[PDB]
């Protein structure tokens, strides 16, 4: 079949994310909106990380670039180095 990678995030997966988020009842229009916000988030982090990768003259995006993008975005993460 032919399907979009943003559609690759399944409704039961978003449902599990909301269950971990403490959501008992989920509207049908929640899933597409969550895909949109997800795409916005990845467009925000991946832009900065790829920018670090370009400033590093490297063609491979490392985990440190991700940690730094999350750091400048306030998303800073632990366990992957930094």
């Amino acid at each position: 079949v032919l399907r979009d990678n943003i559609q690759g995030i399944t409704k039961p997966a978003i449902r599990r994310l909301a269950r971990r988020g403490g959501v008992k009842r989920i509207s049908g229009l929640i899933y597409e909106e969550t895909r949109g916000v997800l795409k916005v988030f990845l467009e925000n982090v991946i832009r900065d990380a790829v920018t670090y990768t370009e400033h590093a003259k490297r063609k491979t995006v490392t985990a440190m670039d991700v940690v730094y993008a999350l750091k400048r975005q306030g998303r800073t993460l632990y366990g992957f180095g930094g």
Partner: protein, 96 residues
């Protein structure tokens, strides 16, 4: 009769206790490579980088679902709505 929901609820509790990524690895990685392809062509990614992106993304969606659920509860509704999400991100400062 015993109150239903039973097993399913038990699996929600156990799946919340045991920690694992709720988004599928290969689809999420295809999405990451697709989004990065627009920024820079012929990019390579580290497994730790993709796993970090999935951790931060899933955590962000969990918190956003928490604030969204708080918006729904403040609306006297037990069901989250795109207006609850938009209000959550609005007060968060991510939009408008």
């Amino acid at each position: 009769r015993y109150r239903p929901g039973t097993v399913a609820l038990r699996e929600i509790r156990r799946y919340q206790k045991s920690t694992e990524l709720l988004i599928r690895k290969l689809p999420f990685q295809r999405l990451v490579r697709e989004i990065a392809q627009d920024f820079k062509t012929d990019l390579r990614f580290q497994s730790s980088a993709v796993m970090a992106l999935q951790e931060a993304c899933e955590a962000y969606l969990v918190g956003l679902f928490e604030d969204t659920n708080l918006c729904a509860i403040h609306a006297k509704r037990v069901t989250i709505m795109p207006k609850d999400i938009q209000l959550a991100r609005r007060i968060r400062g991510e939009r408008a």
